[PDB]
Enzyme design. Structure first.
Site, PDB file in Angstrom:
ATOM      1  N   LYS A   1      20.305  35.801 -34.149  1.00 51.23           N
ATOM      2  CA  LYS A   1      21.253  35.431 -33.627  1.00 51.23           C
ATOM      3  C   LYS A   1      22.279  35.296 -34.798  1.00 51.23           C
ATOM      4  O   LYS A   1      21.806  35.379 -36.001  1.00 51.23           O
ATOM      5  CB  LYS A   1      20.786  33.721 -33.165  1.00 51.23           C
ATOM      6  CG  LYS A   1      20.009  33.642 -32.005  1.00 51.23           C
ATOM      7  CD  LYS A   1      19.941  32.283 -31.449  1.00 51.23           C
ATOM      8  CE  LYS A   1      19.087  32.165 -30.255  1.00 51.23           C
ATOM      9  NZ  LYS A   1      19.403  33.293 -29.417  1.00 51.23           N
TER      10      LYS A   1
ATOM     11  N   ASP B   1      22.690  38.558 -31.393  1.00 46.49           N
ATOM     12  CA  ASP B   1      23.174  37.915 -30.207  1.00 46.49           C
ATOM     13  C   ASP B   1      24.269  36.721 -30.647  1.00 46.49           C
ATOM     14  O   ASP B   1      23.876  35.754 -31.157  1.00 46.49           O
ATOM     15  CB  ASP B   1      22.107  37.245 -29.469  1.00 46.49           C
ATOM     16  CG  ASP B   1      22.303  36.925 -28.079  1.00 46.49           C
ATOM     17  OD1 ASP B   1      23.573  36.412 -27.827  1.00 46.49           O
ATOM     18  OD2 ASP B   1      21.223  36.854 -27.208  1.00 46.49           O
TER      19      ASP B   1
ATOM     20  N   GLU C   1      25.079  41.406 -28.357  1.00 52.65           N
ATOM     21  CA  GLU C   1      24.952  40.593 -27.308  1.00 52.65           C
ATOM     22  C   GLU C   1      25.802  39.745 -26.805  1.00 52.65           C
ATOM     23  O   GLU C   1      25.954  38.847 -27.976  1.00 52.65           O
ATOM     24  CB  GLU C   1      23.292  40.327 -26.972  1.00 52.65           C
ATOM     25  CG  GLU C   1      23.217  39.658 -25.662  1.00 52.65           C
ATOM     26  CD  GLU C   1      21.596  39.869 -25.373  1.00 52.65           C
ATOM     27  OE1 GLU C   1      21.015  40.856 -25.760  1.00 52.65           O
ATOM     28  OE2 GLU C   1      21.130  38.892 -24.690  1.00 52.65           O
TER      29      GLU C   1
ATOM     30  N   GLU D   1      23.228  38.619 -19.124  1.00 56.71           N
ATOM     31  CA  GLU D   1      22.015  37.396 -18.860  1.00 56.71           C
ATOM     32  C   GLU D   1      23.137  36.408 -18.051  1.00 56.71           C
ATOM     33  O   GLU D   1      22.445  35.578 -17.309  1.00 56.71           O
ATOM     34  CB  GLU D   1      21.624  36.946 -20.067  1.00 56.71           C
ATOM     35  CG  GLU D   1      22.456  35.934 -20.765  1.00 56.71           C
ATOM     36  CD  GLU D   1      21.646  35.532 -22.127  1.00 56.71           C
ATOM     37  OE1 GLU D   1      21.344  36.656 -23.092  1.00 56.71           O
ATOM     38  OE2 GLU D   1      21.526  34.348 -22.417  1.00 56.71           O
TER      39      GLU D   1
ATOM     40  N   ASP E   1      19.209  39.567 -15.207  1.00 52.94           N
ATOM     41  CA  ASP E   1      18.460  38.265 -15.241  1.00 52.94           C
ATOM     42  C   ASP E   1      17.692  38.067 -13.882  1.00 52.94           C
ATOM     43  O   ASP E   1      18.727  38.222 -12.960  1.00 52.94           O
ATOM     44  CB  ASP E   1      19.301  37.144 -15.606  1.00 52.94           C
ATOM     45  CG  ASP E   1      18.509  35.942 -15.770  1.00 52.94           C
ATOM     46  OD1 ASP E   1      18.401  35.123 -14.486  1.00 52.94           O
ATOM     47  OD2 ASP E   1      17.859  35.489 -16.784  1.00 52.94           O
TER      48      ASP E   1
ATOM     49  N   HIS F   1      16.647  40.556 -19.687  1.00 55.61           N
ATOM     50  CA  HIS F   1      16.774  39.230 -20.426  1.00 55.61           C
ATOM     51  C   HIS F   1      15.628  38.468 -19.932  1.00 55.61           C
ATOM     52  O   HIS F   1      15.336  38.674 -18.931  1.00 55.61           O
ATOM     53  CB  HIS F   1      18.061  38.499 -20.298  1.00 55.61           C
ATOM     54  CG  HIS F   1      18.159  37.019 -20.498  1.00 55.61           C
ATOM     55  ND1 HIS F   1      18.208  36.576 -21.772  1.00 55.61           N
ATOM     56  CD2 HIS F   1      17.859  35.741 -19.627  1.00 55.61           C
ATOM     57  CE1 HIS F   1      18.181  35.369 -21.749  1.00 55.61           C
ATOM     58  NE2 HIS F   1      17.696  34.847 -20.443  1.00 55.61           N
TER      59      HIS F   1
HETATM   60 MG   LIG Z   1      21.072  36.855 -25.036  1.00 55.11          MG
END
Ligand SMILES: [Mg+2]
Ligand SMILES: [Mg+2]
Lengths: 426, 432
Positions: free
Chosen positions: A212, A240, A266, A293, A316, A343
Site C-alpha cells: 500500500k 495500491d 492499483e 475491485e 470482484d 481481487h
Molecule cells: Mg486494491
C-alpha cells in the site's frame, strides 16, 4: 417439480476490528428449495460493518422475485433469471446497476449459480467451463456492449478455446492457479516487519507481492526501495493507492516509485474516473495501471478498455451483477488483450473469485501463468470449502458449488444482533 | 444548546401508475415514491430540516432503510455546528469508510446521504429565514467554495478557479435577484409526453401546454421507432414550429442504434435527446453526439456524482445537462456540478417531476442564475403537473415560468396528512 421456497438473509458480522477499522461482514443469502435436503444456493455480499443491515434489507427485498420459481427453470436459464432481477425498472432506479441494490442482485444471482453447480454436482469453475459456447453467451447481458463486444464476437472467443478445454482442465487440476499476496504491504507496518513479511511470502512460494502507498511519498520511496532489495529483481511488486489521489498528484507521486520496478499501481484515483486513469497511465509510462475491485458494472469496464485506461484489471466476485456480469467483463478483457488479477480478501471473496479465474483460464483465455488471484489468510475457517494454497498457488476446488456456504455454527455465533457473540458483547 | 434530536423517516408512495403518468420506455408503470426524512431538533418546532429521495415504487423501502441507518451519524449533533459548516457536515457522511464501501458516492447509500445533506441545508435556510435559493445566492464566494468537495476535480475545476467564477458574479447578484423575482424562471413541461398516452391525448395536452404558456415540451421515445416517428410528427404539428420539443429515451439504446434512431427523428426539429444510452457511458454519449450532429444530446438525471459529470464535460459528450436534486450527495455536490457546467459553458436544464423534485430543484437553478451564471433565458426547468398538493410550499407556475419561492426552506416539507394517507404499506390509502 422442485421450487425455491425461501430466500433467507443473514446479517453476519465479524469483530475483525478487535484483531480504517473495518469489521468484516457479509449479507449471507440462502436460496432454499423443497428438493433433496442438500439442494440450496449460497451467496454473499461483502460489507465492512456499518451498512450490512441496509445491504441485508436490499437482498431481502428480492424475495418476491424468487420465491415460487421452479428450480429447473432457473438452472436452465441463468441468463433469464439474472435479467428478471436486473430488468426490474423500479429496482433499476435505485442504481442503475451500481451500489447496494446491484450488489444485492449480484448475491442472489451468485446463489443461483451456486445452486446450478450443486445440482450438476460440479465445482463452479467446472460448471462454467463445461457449458457450451452458446449456453455461456446466453447468460450475458449484451445491452450497452454492442459497440465493443457482440454476441458473435463472444462466440468466436469461446469457440476457439473450445478445443483446448480438456488440456487446460488437466493442467489446472495438477498445477493450480498463481496467487499474489498483500499481507506484507499494510501502511501501519514498520520497515522491518515489511521486509520480514516480504521475505516470508517469497519463501512460501508467492511470485508477486503488493504494498500500500498513498499517505507519505518519502515513506513510499523508502518502503519500495526496501521491499525490492528484500525480494530480489525477479519477484513482482505491485502498489495500491486505494483511490487516494487526484490525477496530477498521482502522476507526480508514481514517477518517484518507477525506479523500484513497479508491477502496477492499483486504483490511483476515483473508481468512476475512466478518463483520469487514462491520464495517469499516460503520465507514468511504462508503469502499468489497474483498477476494478470497485468498478460498478461491465459498462464502466468497457470504457476503461476502450479508453486504454488500464494495463490490467481486477474483478470482484461480489461487486457487480454476479457471475453473468463477470463473464462479460472476462470476455471483454480477453477481447482487448488485458490481463485480469482477481481481487479477494474480505469475507469469502477468495472462495468465490477463484472459480471465475479458473473458469476463465479453461474456457476463455487459456492463460494463467501471466497473472494471479489475490490471497489473504482471513475468515477461511468459517467456510465448508476453504481455499487451499500450495506454495503460492490456488488448488482447484473439487467440491460442488461456489464455495460460499459457511458453517452454520459460524452464522449462529456472529449473526447480528441475535448472534451469540453479539448478544453477550452488547 | 439546540440539538438534532431525531432523524425520522417515512416510506411514502403514490399510485401514479393507475393513469400511466410518468410512463416511459424504461419505466412502464412507475409509482412515484419518496424516502421522506425529517431532521428533528429541540426548541422552535418551526425548526427542522426536510428532505427526500425520489424512488418509483419497489425498493423505496430499502432506500428508506438506507436513510434511517444514518441516524447514528446525525442525532446529537449541535444544530449550530451543522448549519455553520455545511461542508464539514457533508464530508462527515461522504468520508465515512464503511458508508463509502456501499458505493462509493453512487446508488442507494449515496442518495440516502444526499437526502440528509439536503435536509441540513433546508435546516440552515429555515434558521436564516430565507428560501434556499436566496440562502445560497447570498453566501460569499469563500463560504460557497468551502461547502464543496474538490477531490477528484483538480484537473477540471480547482478551488481558485471556482472562486474566480463566484467573484465575477457577486457584483451583479442584486440585479439578477431582481430580474428573477419579477420575471420568474423558464420552464418546460413533460406532462404531454409520457409514453402510454394515446396519440389523441398527446395532441390535446401538447396544445393545452402551449396555451398555458410553455415554450418547450418533452416527449418520451425509445420503445418503437414507428411510434416515435408518428408521435414526434404529431406533437410538432400540435405545437407549431416556434415551440421547442425535446425527446427522452430513458437509457434504452446502445450507441449504434441510438445514432440510427435519432437521425430519423431529426426532421421534426429536436431540441435535444435526453439519455440516449446508459448513464455510465460517457464515451457512448460522446459517440452518439458526434453521429447525430446537429441534434443536441443531454444526460444527467441519473449521473451518480460530480466525477462523472466532470468526465461528461471533458469528453465533450453533451450539449447540455440535467442535474437532479435527489440523485447525488445533496446541495454540496450539485453546487460543484453547476460550477463545472459554468466553467465548461454547458447549459443546465434541471430534471424534475417524480415526488417534489420540482419543489427541490427550482432552488438550485435559481441560485445558479443569481450567483453563478446569470443565464436563464437559454435554459429551463422541467415541470410535471403531479402531486404538488402534498407540499406546504408547492411550486407556482405563471404562464410557463417558475415563480421564485418566498417561504424559508428547500420546499421539501410535506403535509402530515399526505404522509398518513400514503405511507407504505400501513398507510390509509394503501389499506385497500
Ligand atoms: Mg486494491
Ligand atoms: Mg429524463
Amino acid at each position: 417439480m422442485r421450487t425455491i421456497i425461501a430466500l433467507e438473509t443473514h446479517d453476519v458480522r465479524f469483530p475483525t476490528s478487535r484483531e480504517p477499522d473495518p469489521d468484516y461482514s457479509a449479507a449471507y443469502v440462502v436460496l432454499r428449495t423443497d428438493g433433496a435436503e442438500d439442494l440450496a444456493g449460497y451467496g454473499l455480499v461483502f460489507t465492512i460493518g456499518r451498512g450490512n443491515d441496509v445491504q441485508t434489507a436490499a437482498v431481502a427485498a428480492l424475495a418476491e422475485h424468487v420465491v415460487g420459481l421452479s428450480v429447473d427453470k432457473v438452472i436452465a436459464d441463468l441468463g433469464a433469471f439474472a435479467r428478471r432481477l436486473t430488468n426490474d425498472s423500479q429496482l433499476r432506479w435505485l442504481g442503475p446497476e451500481k451500489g447496494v441494490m446491484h450488489m444485492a442482485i449480484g448475491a442472489v444471482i451468485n446463489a443461483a449459480w451456486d445452486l446450478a453447480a450443486r445440482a450438476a454436482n460440479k465445482p463452479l469453475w467446472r460448471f462454467i467451463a463445461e457449458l457450451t459456447p452458446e449456453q455461456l453467451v446466453d447468460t450475458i447481458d449484451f445491452r450497452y456492449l454492442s459497440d465493443a463486444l457482440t454476441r458473435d464476437e463472444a462466440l468466436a472467443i469461446l469457440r476457439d478455446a473450445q478445443p483446448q478445454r480438456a488440456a487446460r482442465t488437466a493442467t489446472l487440476i495438477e498445477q493450480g492457479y498463481p496467487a499474489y499476496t498483500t499481507s506484507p504491504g499494510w501502511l501501519g507496518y514498520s520497515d522491518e516487519k515489511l521486509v520480514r513479511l516480504a521475505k516470508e511470502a517469497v519463501a512460501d512460494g508467492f511470485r508477486t507481492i503488493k504494498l500500500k502507498v498513498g499517505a507519505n511519498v518519502q515513506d513510499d520511496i523508502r518502503r519500495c526501495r526496501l521491499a525490492r532489495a528484500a525480494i530480489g529483481p525477479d519477484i513482482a511488486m505491485a502498489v495500491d493507492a486505494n483511490q487516494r489521489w487526484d490525477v496530477g498528484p498521482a502522476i507526480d507521486w508514481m514517477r518517484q516509485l518507477a525506479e523500484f520496478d513497479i508491477a502496477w499501481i492499483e486504483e490511483p484515483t476515483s473508481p468512476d474516473d475512466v478518463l483520469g486513469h487514462a491520464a495517469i497511465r499516460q503520465g507514468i509510462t511504462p508503469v502499468p495501471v489497474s483498477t476494478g475491485e470497485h468498478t460498478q458494472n461491465r459498462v464502466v469496464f468497457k470504457q476503461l478498455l476502450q479508453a486504454g485506461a488500464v494495463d490490467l484489471i481486477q474483478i470482484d466476485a461480489a461487486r457487480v451483477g454476479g457471475v453473468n456480469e463477470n463473464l462479460a467483463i472476462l470476455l471483454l478483457a480477453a477481447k482487448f488483450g488485458v490481463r485480469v488479477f482477481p481481487h479477494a480478501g474480505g469475507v469469502g471473496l477468495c472462495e468465490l473469485v477463484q472459480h471465475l479465474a479458473m473458469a476463465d483460464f479453461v474456457a476463455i483465455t487459456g492463460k494463467m501463468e501471466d497473472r494471479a488471484i489475490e490471497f489473504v489468510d482471513h475468515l477461511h475457517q468459517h467456510f465448508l470449502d476453504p481455499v487451499r494454497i500450495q506454495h503460492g498457488r490456488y488448488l482447484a476446488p473439487e467440491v460442488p458449488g461456489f464455495s460460499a456456504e459457511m458453517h452454520p455454527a459460524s452464522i449462529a455465533e456472529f449473526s447480528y444482533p441475535d448472534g451469540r457473540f453479539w448478544v453477550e458483547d452488547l
